[model samples]
Target: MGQTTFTELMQQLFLKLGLNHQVNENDVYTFEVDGHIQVLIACYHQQWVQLFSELGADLPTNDNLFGEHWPAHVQGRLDGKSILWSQQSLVGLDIDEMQAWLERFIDDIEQRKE
Candidate 1:
């Protein structure tokens, strides 16, 4: 199979999540988790897909999020007020798995408060 475009892959994800918002023509998508934290996924230079979400103010790096034991292809890093998760190749983009990634990320954020 051939590699898919960033917009195409994100559109597939949008459908999988039952999102009502339109996938913008500029190769970016944004949504919130139950009206709490917001998530952004964008394509850079046509190939790089980056996912970002704010973990709230002054959040420190969560080591568990970047450990080898964590999910594959989806890697996270501290980004000031937020953290970023990215997948380099579009081939690694799985709709169902990405859905779970969002869910797991939400859980991770909640876990931090405890």
Candidate 2:
């Protein structure tokens, strides 16, 4: 497992946030949140955890879903499987920071109505 500690770090964050979830074991890859929105968390060499989630609904491609949490690159897929994603460089961010970014990332797309 390339990320046993890192995986636990991600899992601990979700727990601290009070998110009731079913987590994967070893090299962690968070799959879902609160029985609704799907989620994915990843980290490399102790860097911050990257977040990815499926866009709640199909909306216009021009939905302007980018900002603080949105990384300019690898932001998301623009077509059928549009997703909300972000990268938090661990330079200064931590579990709380990454989780906050994730929370907003989920809200950004989830709030968009069909």
Candidate 3:
């Protein structure tokens, strides 16, 4: 998609995820879930993901295969959900995973309400 279209999609996604307040026009889109801040970008046109993987060791530092396999694996999983990247790591979690995590977190929070 074009940058404008992508921006619009990002806006909608941010609102849907309760992260509208955190979005910055210059910073692309980002959100915090499961104690991690996830930055979202469309790599549809760029080879940045592949290049980044090659430049560094695995994100978690323990999985040497992570760099080699993650590029193809993540590309296959991109639907309309958020793909996550940290300074040195890459993770892709679809909406279902996000929802499940949110549900569990909410449940844990509710348990603490007692």
**Each prediction's Cα lDDT score?**
0.60, 0.62, 0.35
For candidate 2, the TM-score is: 0.66
On the 0 to 100 scale, the lDDT of residue 46 in model 3 is: 22
Instruction: Rank candidates by lDDT, best first.
Output: 2, 1, 3
In model 2, the clashing pairs are none
Model 3, 58-83: lDDT tens per residue? 22222323443223222111243323
Ranking by TM-score: 2, 1, 3
Best by lDDT: 2
Please report the TM-score between candidate 3 and the true structure. 0.35
Question: Over 4 Å off in model 3, which ranges?
Answer: 25-27, 34-60, 64-114
Those runs of model 2 whose alpha carbons end farther than 4 Å from true positions after fitting are 1-5, 22-26, 45-48, 63-75
Error of 3 at 38 (Å): 4.9
